[PDB]
Design an enzyme around this catalytic site. Structure first.
Site, PDB file in Angstrom:
ATOM      1  N   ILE A 290      87.065 -73.624   8.776  1.00 35.99           N
ATOM      2  CA  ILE A 290      88.244 -73.548   7.919  1.00 35.99           C
ATOM      3  C   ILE A 290      88.527 -72.101   7.549  1.00 35.99           C
ATOM      4  CG2 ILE A 290      87.818 -75.867   7.052  1.00 35.99           C
ATOM      5  CD1 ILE A 290      86.632 -74.826   4.620  1.00 35.99           C
TER       6      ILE A 290
ATOM      7  N   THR B 114      89.218 -67.113   1.490  1.00 35.19           N
ATOM      8  CA  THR B 114      87.946 -67.350   0.821  1.00 35.19           C
ATOM      9  C   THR B 114      86.790 -66.765   1.627  1.00 35.19           C
ATOM     10  OG1 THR B 114      88.960 -69.446   0.154  1.00 35.19           O
ATOM     11  CG2 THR B 114      86.654 -69.088  -0.448  1.00 35.19           C
TER      12      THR B 114
ATOM     13  N   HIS C 184      83.931 -66.423   1.549  1.00 40.67           N
ATOM     14  CA  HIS C 184      82.753 -67.278   1.649  1.00 40.67           C
ATOM     15  C   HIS C 184      82.666 -67.945   3.016  1.00 40.67           C
ATOM     16  CE1 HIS C 184      79.886 -70.499   0.694  1.00 40.67           C
ATOM     17  NE2 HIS C 184      80.792 -71.354   1.130  1.00 40.67           N
TER      18      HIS C 184
ATOM     19  N   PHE D 103      79.602 -76.249  23.096  1.00 44.19           N
ATOM     20  CA  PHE D 103      80.310 -75.794  21.906  1.00 44.19           C
ATOM     21  C   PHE D 103      81.646 -76.520  21.802  1.00 44.19           C
ATOM     22  CE2 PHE D 103      82.262 -72.239  19.333  1.00 44.19           C
ATOM     23  CZ  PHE D 103      81.427 -72.402  18.260  1.00 44.19           C
TER      24      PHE D 103
END
Lengths: 151, 148, 153, 148, 148, 148, 148, 148, 148
Positions: H112, H116, H118, H143
């Site tokens: 995502i 952010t 993070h 993958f």
């Protein structure tokens, strides 16, 4: 019908709703077909009540006259109309609740004028008139008509 | 194509759903699901329509009856009530929804968008009254009011 | 369908009811005197019979006027079995057809509905003038009210 | 098509309409709607036309004949009368309308607004004269007079 | 008038023209000119109409039936079929055109092209199917579609 | 809603219309009207759905099955055929339509037009094939193809 | 995440809070604090989910069931009710809340506000009905309605 | 298509390549070429799929299972492990890869990234872990991670 | 609301997942699925938190313990280790993850975004160390480091 002022229109609704309710309470149709209930525009033997505010009595006076003319033209009687005056729009709902609980009155008409173009505070007053009148009709199961003008 | 057809379809489903909830019988040990079929046989309906906007309501009322007849219902089981304006729909609906022979009620009408406080306040009260009345009486009432 | 104030079909029907009731009062037994007598009409349609004459031109406009006229009679107490409707090609033919209806012994009033396109070009200013003349003359000669619902676009 | 085609159509419908009013009424229990068909079989017609601008007027008279034949009417049931000018159309139309074997009359002509003042009293009198005939004799008379 | 009126006339004219072509010959010794009259007594018809709301196609169907009855036809000799949408017209038109007791077919519909794909593809196929059916069954079919 | 639901509604109505249209006709005394009811009790269906756009087409197929079952149909009377892409839909539809125990066919798929002219030609051929099959076999085939 | 998961977490915690709050109070000697644990062993739940936006609402319902089962609940102790649209959610929630074997109710649905003022009035009435029911019946009802 | 299908194709081919590469070599007389067939009869697989973005990852997992079954594999020879997020994929993949009855592993998930920070660090660590595990354990890991 | 709660929730699920993988028992002939419940009873956790940014970490550590206690865990089974800065988290985590009593480790901290090479390099190394350590020791370690 022809006059057009909101007093005339507000009275036409009251005459029709008063007739409709008697049809509903009477009985059903013969059967073997779709049942239809409607009210006609005859005011022979109906009792009415009118609640009107005093603010801007110049415009209100014509509206109250128009509603009375409509009733007589269709067969009504001037002696079967009750009128109540209130200081202002905030008091219309509470006053109409007293008429509606009478065992004689069959419909109630509310007339008034609202000022919503000069002060950005009257919106609170205006919104409560529409709510209170609408809740009363459901609670008392009696038609109450809206005849409020906005300036 | 018209909200009269859509409102009648919701009424059929809600009527059949309330027969399943108010029922008892055997059940399995798995999850329980309640749904409504679209068979209109044996049900009894009520319609409340306003006269405003002249002939547009007649188009909506025609669509409502077409839905009921073509899904299996009988035209002898419909009751039609006509009111002068949109402001009068909630009070007429309450009378029609308080009799035990009716299973669901359909409300049809046309509202005006004149950008005036006279119409803006009337519009809000029509929706609130029909919403409260269905919760008070525990009967499904469907919303089929359009604008312009 | 139907209508209310605003449509010309509704106003015309109003006048017919008032005039139809007024005449029945005039032909009635005279009063006892002792004061001035005021005669006026009631907006009740019970027991009355009507006729409507409509033109097929401009189907969009005319159709909604005819619905207004029929709506007024029913709401005010009329009976659907006591209305006769007549369609005609255009406005020029309205007066002749109206005369046929007015002579029926069981018609109390007649309502004329149509649309005029006067002003655009000739061949229509002549038509517009004669429609007004003919309907007026018929009313006096036959002694039945005849309402004028003709509009202009 | 041309104004002559239109005039013939109106005559056929009015002629059939009058034949229905003189007949018995409907079964009842509902509105009686009287209307005229467009069948032209068994009907007798009459046409009155002027010589002025014979180029244009001839086209209009052909149109009326075509319309009646296409709709199923014979040419043996048509009477055609010609007159010197517009002023004589109404008096000529009166003679035809009094016969008991003619069910409709059609007037064809052309006028000239941009003319001398003398040719203005005539223009308005044509419309008046034909209108008064129909009410007096109670028999449809159709209008087909155009202007150049 | 409306396109339901216009479409029905072409069926009256073309149904008469065919009866003349497959029958007795003309006077002879000169050119033969063919044409259909606007009579409709004795002819049988079929109407196929779609559904778009409940108002705008009802008018076109009523305009069609009025043309046939006023021009001499009988209501006993009309068959009306309703279908869900425009895409379904050609398959329904085929069934009627194969019946020995039908002389022409009128197709009435509403194309809402110009809005979104899934509808620019349906429009192109409706015209082709009716065109092919007429050349394959030798029975005229008239086109009565509007654009929303 | 979704075209899966719409395509199944059309199929249910046409399947009922072809039963009454192939039965005994009306005795007479009035105009004959044929209409399709929305009841799916005793009818068989086939569905052809492509695979491209994995997520979308699965939602459409669920909509179609839900419509049939909730109108009275049985899940045992549905046949489902999967194909690689839109190009393959018409060929598979022919095989299903030629069986004698299927009343209607529903075609679902996603067209990815928008670029790569390879896919602009495929779009035009799917509609053509489905339209011709319906007329050739005389069975209703419904169009449930959308564009991404 | 998705509001289906969030709405089920809130319901699990309020169901536990009402068990301790209705039991014996603390002896004393300190301030009393009531909190809800996130354990769902021995509790019953009901779910009301609409149908519009076919794809979205199915994802939300799966989220809610996954939350309950993974916290210790049993799939046999869940009741699911489907309704046509958002307008119908409050009326169905009343029936579930009035049963004596349900501890909390979860309401899921999609509001399609954005145009068509018909849908702007529906949005305001769903919240009002759910809020009043919770206070009237004294049972927690969780709000899981999103906007597309 | 979807990366679920692509990731399963790669796993099937590498599983076949490692069987021939670990068997007897060619006799000689030409260059030796090793290739993988697209047949999945007798091979075992494991799948590791995260949970975030509830709707997307479920579509990817269905694609992977469909690929294996339609190439000859058995649904009984597939192992599925669910993890909370992308950060947890590499650790779970290690456990599956160390079993002696698994021939290849497929990793699916949604990153995502987009804001952010993070989540910007998590993205770089998932690829690193999967790459090192394949080289350390000498087993193919595919993958199948996309970005929203 | 805070990453401390989120990190602790992943740890609970991963701890329960690793008990299922390292287990034996009867199984069916269908597909095998391994999932993790959210019951925290009987598990033992470890937390490593930095002091940077003063009090913001105390908010994150509070959320972590709230998750463990409310999901069934006991506060006697948590071990808290405090380190001076983010650069020191990986070395402290390795010591805490090498003892057999710990089941999962949670890392919490705050990073600076001063747009300087001093902080940009420190940020990368924190993520890489925790990623490698979970693969080396085969124990789940969760990432709960935020920025600013």
């Amino acid at each position: 019908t022809k006059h057009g002022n909101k007093g005339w229109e507000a009275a036409l609704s009251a005459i029709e709703m008063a007739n409709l309710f008697k049809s509903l309470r009477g009985t059903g149709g013969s059967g073997s077909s779709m049942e239809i209930y409607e009210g006609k525009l005859t005011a022979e033997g109906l009792r009415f009540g009118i609640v009107a505010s005093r603010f801007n009595h110049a415009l209100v006076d014509r509206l109250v006259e128009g509603a009375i003319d409509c009733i007589v033209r269709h067969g009504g009687r001037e002696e079967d109309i009750t009128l109540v005056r209130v200081p202002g729009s905030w008091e219309i709902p509470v006053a109409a609740g007293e008429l509606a609980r009478k065992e004689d009155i069959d419909a109630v008409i509310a007339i008034g004028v609202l000022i919503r173009g000069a002060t950005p505070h009257f919106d609170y007053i205006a919104s409560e008139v529409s709510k209170g009148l609408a809740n009363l009709s459901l609670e008392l199961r009696k038609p109450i008509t809206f005849g409020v003008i906005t300036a």
